[PDB]
């Protein structure tokens, strides 16, 4: 977890298991940023604030 008012621009691949991920993709490792699917048909609470 980040500290108070820390910012993090990092885009390097996250590892989610015991085995290494010395590369761009895998089963137990991921790109760390995910997009919000902000469609107007989303209910409130799923809309952008």
């Amino acid at each position: 977890n980040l500290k108070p008012f820390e910012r993090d621009i990092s885009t390097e691949i996250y590892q989610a298991g015991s085995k290494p991920c010395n590369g761009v993709e895998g089963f137990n490792c991921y790109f760390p940023l995910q997009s919000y699917g902000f469609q107007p048909t989303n209910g409130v609470g799923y809309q952008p604030y």
Partner: protein, 50 residues
């Protein structure tokens, strides 16, 4: 019984492994009163419906 989910999850044989109440790393130390394993065969197209 004692459940070694770290042996289970870090295996390569699973084409899908997905958890919904927890991130899977909690299972190594989190405790429960009982556990049920519900086990069956389906088309690979339909694993998403589970």
């Amino acid at each position: 019984c004692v459940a070694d989910y770290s042996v289970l999850y870090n295996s390569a044989s699973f084409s899908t492994f997905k958890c919904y109440g927890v991130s899977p790393t909690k299972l190594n130390d989190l405790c429960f009163t009982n556990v049920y394993a519900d086990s069956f065969v389906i088309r690979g197209d339909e694993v998403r419906q589970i």
